[PDB]
Amino acid sequence: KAVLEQFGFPLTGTEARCYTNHALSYDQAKRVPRWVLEHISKSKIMGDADRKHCKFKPDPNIPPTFSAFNEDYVGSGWSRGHMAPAGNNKFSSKAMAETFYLSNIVPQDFDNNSGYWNRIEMYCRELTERFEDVWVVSGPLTLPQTRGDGKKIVSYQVIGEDNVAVPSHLYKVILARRSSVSTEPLALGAFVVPNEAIGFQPQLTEFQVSLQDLEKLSGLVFFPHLDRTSDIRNICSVDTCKLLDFQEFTLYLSTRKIEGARSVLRLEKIMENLKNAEIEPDDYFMSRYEKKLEELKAKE
Amino acid sequence: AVLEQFGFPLTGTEARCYTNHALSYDQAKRVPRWVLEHISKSKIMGDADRKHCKFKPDPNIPPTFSAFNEDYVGSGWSRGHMAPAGNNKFSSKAMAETFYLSNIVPQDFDNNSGYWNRIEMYCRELTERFEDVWVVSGPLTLPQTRGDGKKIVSYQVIGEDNVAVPSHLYKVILARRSSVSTEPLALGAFVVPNEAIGFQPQLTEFQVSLQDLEKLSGLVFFPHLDRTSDIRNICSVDTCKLLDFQEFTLYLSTRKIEGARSVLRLEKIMENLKNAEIEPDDYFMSRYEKKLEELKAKE
Ligand SMILES: [Mg+2]
Ligand SMILES: [Mg+2]
């Protein structure tokens, strides 16, 4: 071993890298994370960290020769997709900024990012209403397709001068613990979604896969300390695996748009769109709406 | 601490060390990422016999991430050694470990028995001129540019376990003249397509900068090597000259002698060699006559 190692073994750069509220293993060949692990709680998703102040940038800890850069993404047709989302880190502006390091980012379909994937992210945060602790591992996959001659082929686009790999699919593994002293079994689910637009017809359980199947697809072992001889419940049986429906999600998005409205006309438009979609505003929308109206009336 | 309560995901990329090679395994592709070996005059000599070895799953790899012979047999692809059997004549154990599928990628049959074998033979030849030679070999899946300018990585996966077929193979060669020599080290990096390659392209046509290969592979090779110091191009201080058609064909024909089971087959080896317009050398005729006497002395 000494003779072989005389000038060192090759370095793969796969070591776990830690940040304020997430950790990841980076793929230096694909210029994306292999996996990103985070922990979510009630208190971490509250706070005044503001995603509007964050900017994407290369992770300063990655050797530049293996980093992606914003030039790889901008104008590629793909969005910069967070694996650990900014919204899980309202409690810390530093933790949020670190999710904008490109080590946390994959090329993601714009509609998937702002649609189905966002709804899954929101469900992960919703779980903290019912579980004290939630762990999530997120990452990309490049899965095979069978072509006309029966051969199975893995095909993926690489974008930019740095050849950043565009995944065919994205995965989440969700682990939830009711409390730190409860004897209730842990709840786990694994999900794989295609990196494309997905509407409201498929329920999250349609994308659920067995943990063992995802490990075989990804070449990873998730939560290895987790005792798999003990009883672990399917998260979609003990919990809901119910994403926000069109009305709830549209109301959510419309409420968010209030805070960026720069004129009274934009506000009324937001209201009229909601009314034309036959969605009634809830008390929270009306609170934010009326406060924004008064704010805009008091500004130049 | 909470984040890590149930462990980080395992990627399984730790270096795995064997008798005369080491590797880092890719559990998703079911192939090595890199295989490092050391070659010397003495290691390529000995009585270890490749014909006794069997391909098998590496007993150290979790079965869920291992390839199996069933993935390769009948796939259209050969089981290609990264660390070759022929570098381990000194040790039957070392050779057998190169037949663990953790050392194996799906390799084009003609590439395996042709251009890649010629590169393997050149690496062994270097031990005549350098006391120590290190080699890192591995697979690559590189992109091709489509008609619209889109760059696409496409590779086949074979068998029930979806073993990844590389588009290209790489070798990094590092050579040191002696343990007491002052001259700089010799290094070369090479990338060849995983397809039939004839005798026209010289090895230097497939040479790449170390930096370029590292960018393509996501690897850093020989990290203790001080690249500040002057490291010479292996193809400048040595020849990077592969065996030509006549030399290689003679080599292959000489090998087929030892497996001849009849004077009939033994004469057809001679015929094929001559009909290739190659004349036997003294060594060929030596082994040929030894085998002729042997076969006449057997049932
Ligand atoms: Mg997103
Ligand atoms: Mg071979």
Author numbering:
A (entry chain B): 59 to 358
B (entry chain A): 60 to 358
Give the authors' words:
Apo hEXOG is a symmetrical homodimer. Each monomer contains a Core domain that is extremely similar to that of EndoG (r.m.s.d.=0.8 Å), and a helical-bundle Wing domain that corresponds to the C-terminal extension. The N terminus of each hEXOG monomer undergoes a domain-swap where the folding of the region is identical to that in EndoG, but the involved residues are from the opposing monomer rather than from the same monomer in EndoG: the residues 58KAVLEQFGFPLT70 (hydrophobic residues are bold) of one monomer collapse on a hydrophobic patch (277GLVFFPHL284) of the opposing monomer 30 Å away. The swapped domains represent 45% of the total dimer interface in hEXOG, and thus contribute substantially to dimer stability. A Mg2+ is found in each active site, forming octahedron coordination with five water molecules and Nδ of N171. In contrast to the completely solvent exposed active site of EndoG, the active site of hEXOG is an enclosed V-shaped cleft. The cleft, measuring 32–35 Å in depth and 15 Å in width, is lined with positively charged residues from both Core and Wing domains, and is both electrostatically and dimensionally capable of accommodating dsDNA at its end. Interestingly, R138 and R314 bind two sulfate molecules in the apo structure in an essentially identical manner to the phosphdiester backbone of substrate DNA, reflecting their affinity for negative charges.
Human mitochondrial nuclease EXOG (hEXOG) is important for mtDNA integrity. hEXOG depletion selectively increases lesions in mtDNA, but has no effect on chromosomal DNA. Human EXOG shares sequence homology with members of ββα-Me nuclease family, which contains nonspecific endonucleases. Conversely, in mitochondrial LP-BER, the nuclease reaction occurs before DNA synthesis: hEXOG processes the 5′-end of DNA downstream of the lesion, generating an optimal substrate for DNA synthesis catalysed by Pol γ.
